[PDB]
Amino acid sequence: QLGNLPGVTSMGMGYDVNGLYASPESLLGQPLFDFGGELDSIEIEGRSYTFPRSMHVHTYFHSDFKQDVSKEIEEYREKMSQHVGVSGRYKLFSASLSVDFTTTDQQLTEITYSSTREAHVLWYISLPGAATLRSMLRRDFRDDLNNPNMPAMELFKRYGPYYISEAAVGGRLDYSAASKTLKMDSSQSLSTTAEMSYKALVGEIKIEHGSEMEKQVNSFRSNSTIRLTATGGKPGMTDRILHGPDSQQAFSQWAESLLDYATLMDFSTESLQPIWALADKPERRVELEDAFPEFMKQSQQSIPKVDKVLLMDARPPMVKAGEDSGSGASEDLAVFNPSTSNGYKMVGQFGQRNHASVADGHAPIFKDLFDLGVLKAPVGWQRVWDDAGSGKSKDYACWRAIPPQGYRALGDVMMLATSGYNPPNLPDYVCVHQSLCADVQTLQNRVWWDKGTGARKDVSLWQPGAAGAVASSCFAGVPNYNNPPNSGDIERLRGSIACVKTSAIASMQEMKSMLSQHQGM
Amino acid sequence: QLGNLPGVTSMGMGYDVNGLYASPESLLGQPLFDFGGELDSIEIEGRSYTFPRSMHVHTYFHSDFKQDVSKEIEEYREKMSQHVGVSGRYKLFSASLSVDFTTTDQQLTEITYSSTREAHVLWYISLPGAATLRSMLRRDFRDDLNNPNMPAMELFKRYGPYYISEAAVGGRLDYSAASKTLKMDSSQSLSTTAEMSYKALVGEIKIEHGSEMEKQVNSFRSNSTIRLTATGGKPGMTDRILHGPDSQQAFSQWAESLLDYATLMDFSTESLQPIWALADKPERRVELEDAFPEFMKQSQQSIPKVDKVLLMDARPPMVKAGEDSGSGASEDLAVFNPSTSNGYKMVGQFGQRNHASVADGHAPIFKDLFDLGVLKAPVGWQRVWDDAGSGKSKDYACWRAIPPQGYRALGDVMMLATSGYNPPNLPDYVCVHQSLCADVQTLQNRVWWDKGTGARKDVSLWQPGAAGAVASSCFAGVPNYNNPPNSGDIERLRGSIACVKTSAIASMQEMKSMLSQHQGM
Amino acid sequence: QLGNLPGVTSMGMGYDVNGLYASPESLLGQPLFDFGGELDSIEIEGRSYTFPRSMHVHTYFHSDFKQDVSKEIEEYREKMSQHVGVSGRYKLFSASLSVDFTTTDQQLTEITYSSTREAHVLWYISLPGAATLRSMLRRDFRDDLNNPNMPAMELFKRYGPYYISEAAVGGRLDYSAASKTLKMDSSQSLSTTAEMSYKALVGEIKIEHGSEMEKQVNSFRSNSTIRLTATGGKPGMTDRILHGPDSQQAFSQWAESLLDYATLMDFSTESLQPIWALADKPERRVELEDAFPEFMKQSQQSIPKVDKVLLMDARPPMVKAGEDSGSGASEDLAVFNPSTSNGYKMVGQFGQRNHASVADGHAPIFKDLFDLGVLKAPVGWQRVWDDAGSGKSKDYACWRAIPPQGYRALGDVMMLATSGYNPPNLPDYVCVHQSLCADVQTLQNRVWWDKGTGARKDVSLWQPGAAGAVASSCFAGVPNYNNPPNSGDIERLRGSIACVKTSAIASMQEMKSMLSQHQGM
């Protein structure tokens, strides 16, 4: 097809709707239409550009800004496919996913997927409707399209199920981010932070050193995998814009280059039009259209997800962390911390109704394997109970982790035989994100209570449990001697203490096995 | 000429942007462009059509539904002008106002303006962009457009400041309503009621007799002025659809007629394009564009409004409505109702510190002249005070109108020397809509209090007042003997009692005079 | 991409050197080079074009006129292959032969082959030299090119032995003619007539009705097979330029279209460059270059020729055409004409030294089977001898055909016992073109002489012969009694009388057999 206006060669081409988003790379071989040799022209900066009179050109020298953001990869895919002309609610452009995101991040959970796109439109080119184009078909496309013995799948492989009917021409930048939001001071919206980061990068804004915006953007950048992909424009500029020496200059070079390097780079609601509408016979239009779901079947499969994000070690070394000796409580209590290393973290104490030097069991430790921020340190500690009133010279207390917003603690910590109510000093204690935990349902197998001590306040240490949660090795204080604890005592724990789901957890070996069924990890 | 496809003759014509909404009646004389003598032909549902090669046709047999609704005429006008391609925030299509609404309703206040439009699109026709059309100008338009000595105003008179670049072709119905919402059980949104009324009318829905939807639609219809205007389609059908025997059939006749009577009838965001974009020189584009505000000046004037909606009689006959004789209160109290007739309404009692048979002053009465529902009966009455504990055989009480939602009472009513606490029986008492009233600011010139009566509860009758409100002749009870009342006593009155604004009020003669400066009233 | 400058996609492509002359149709699949993604832009007649920085563009809006003309097909082929960059003396572009000429004309002899080409160059595109391109090879081409186990033949099949290094871009017309010049008033050169015919066709000249040039061009056209082939330019124009109603307008449409339809259409001396020069190792360059002769072997076969263009009937009916009765010559003479029909032609009389009613032998007759104009009537007849002075009342004469320019007579005709010196009246007597004849070498087997008649002038009839000529059945007069005739008598015959070559002649059966080995005749 004819004339020298950039983009003209993309018009009326078949498109791989499962390929890249609005890129020439996903155009398919054969032109579908013969657009006629008569040409129109337009003047741009002193020069003439020609294109077929059968196309319409609308100059719009301006920037379209778009964001698709989601915590859920499948919703991201849907959002990215909206308003490009493909009827149905298909997840299109599957090949762009691996352009925009690592295969690991696609499959990881707790990742936010953002595509922040700035389209530098020079002009839009648009074709006539199906019924006009019907008389403009190239010979072998017309034959294949209208042959009833040419099956839909072949037709769609040869020509694409959709063709380019309208396109924005110029250059586009895609600032795509896989963000670990749980690590990210998450007050301001991710999409706004992404916008600002992109705009600072290309110099549309300057961020003042030491600002709140700088903090927010630095957090985004250092806790995301970020790519910059250019469709159209001078090639090999994106590495310099993203990282390299002078990003604002490299960007302005790409921007000023657009007229010489313009390509199809964006879609509107009318961009992709089905080839079936071009068929002569209604029966053929319909049979081709009916076949689209099966053509798309492979592309509509979900991305596989890694739900098992906590690496468990159920038998770490247990070290003694106090006895209730001197407390005057009838029962003996000893507590034990698990020793932690290699990024494994404590979630609770192991408790015993005795004074032994050795733990009766093990408190598991968990590691945030994929560094998603699903484990986060507590913001502080509060008292479930202390021995005020017992008159004993030494002090005995039950403490709770105060979790940061969105997280939960899995077990309390006793501080026994102390000089003053010293709070837990447990650098490797963490709370676990809500998403991985279930609210406590049962409280069973009482470890201990303070009765006999003669303290005003009361406490009993109980083993929490939930539907689907790991059989806990930890305890939670209830401020009374109810046996068993009632649903009011269980309600009190909601939002603060929880149990960790089996679906979020795996041992060293279960993790190896689960991961070996996910490509590129 | 330009082929036989309906709509083609509208394309590339100047448009009166101050005329009707997307109608051929507002096309302007001179063709702007030479579209080539070459024609395409197209088959559209069994019929053959021709049109210029340079235009694009998109067939889409479907209905677009749109609503612009507002309580404020100027906002309605803005809403109606959105997304038709005219940059700026201009109020377009001023001539449609008198098509859609009576001149009275336009100027009345408390009216909700709705345009509910159903566009029956057969196809869209669209032109090239400005830059392509630049080489396709007719000779005299090119000369005038580009001549620097041809002033903007003439150019705009001759050609229109905007031209039709894209249009929907078929037929449109405009179901336009001037609704008196204060009379209208206003729980469900007006726009939804308007939608349902239109849809029932043309048979897209059926409304079940005795339903909630029927009540809502009946209320809409009998408290609105409603018009149905057709652009395109067989003429003289709107009367039968709106009123006459079988509106669903009359509508289906208009709908099936559209192929023979199709015209330009709707605009999209790209429909109206400025002629200035067609000028060769940037200086000329700019000077033409700068002249647009003055071209539009007359059209942007506000619609004149009737703010004075209450007809006041400040000196009606006062009739006695009781004394505190037998109450044992130190002070004497007598109260007087104004006599009401001819749709004039009582808003409060006149109160006196004496036992006279004659009123010392007058309590004004007000008439809802334009039947806007700005006066509405109270939903009930509650007691500010009674004489419980005084031990007197007869009863004495101060009552407040409980206003319906959105209204306010202007004065309380005493019930004095009664057998049981009988509530006021005042068929012509009304509350006044919020919009016409100001919250009470002062409480002055105490009329009376009950001290001496020996009742547990206390009351003092005070004259309310506000900045800009008519000097009240009524009273309000405060449940204590504070002298003067404090800001807590004044706060208690907020949302219940108010004073009526001078701006909402006029005497018989002021109303005649004010109305004589509004056309058609 | 490689930019939008027409021609760019042809650059650095393999070329089928045995295909068409400078056409995109003979480009071969895989691009050889990676030209860099950096693009220059250039202004060409108001329009902007892009192309790879590594290529050079030279605009030169002009017409190159070229003719390759030859009587000999193999020389035509050589001429057409000159100055395109292919070292050696190869006959290139063999596929253009059947584009330009019918297969019959290719194989026929006495055909003049002309290609008259008018190349409308817009620009040249040129690549770097071999040594620069060596670092720009695509991966698989580099691997194959430099792999010593990849044989030359495969390499050449996959990539082509030569690539496009420099090309003219625009449109070319090829006015190709297979001319039967022997039918063609051949005074002015064929190449000039071809030039004028082409130039009149496209309107670069107008030829005046009734002119010498009109006669010459009409003769060319009606005695040639003529084709017009366009490389580049608006397609489907050549039929109208060649034949149809307005050829000068159709040509001007093609000419003004060139900018929109420009392609590679001409080669210069640097256009085709060998792939072997791109190989890293000199040993590899050499082995690839050594293999070129065998790659080209099939293409260098000669076109099969039909040299046997006279259909002979050696035994036609012989009818008596006079005796020398009454002449007084000692010897008897009788002569016989062969009867002619069906386009067979007489070349001479049979002569006898007797008075018999029956011929002692046969004079062959010949037919111009392929209508090449190898036989042409004589322009007149002159006397070798008459019986003036014998005093006999009746007359006796020997006549010679005066051949038209370029032809020869094979035998004389006696006119015996006539009333007045009446010249031969032999409508079917012809001379034979020079090309098929050999000058007379011997004169043997005297038939007769006039001695005894007593005529001033003398004559002897001798049988002519030559190396390679058919043993003649005809005679030639020598104006004396030399026995045998001397080399002066033989010289006198040169340019006028000749003998017909065995190589030009075949009987009905030999012709059938010879023709059955030539496809499509």
TrEMBL record, chains A, B, C:
Pfam families: MACPF, Vps62. InterPro entries: MACPF, Vps62. Residues 1-310 form the MACPF domain. It comes from the Bacteria. PANTHER family: VACUOLAR PROTEIN SORTING-ASSOCIATED PROTEIN 62, VACUOLAR PROTEIN SORTING-ASSOCIATED PROTEIN 62-RELATED. This is Gram-negative insecticidal protein. It comes from Chromobacterium piscinae. The gene is GNIP.
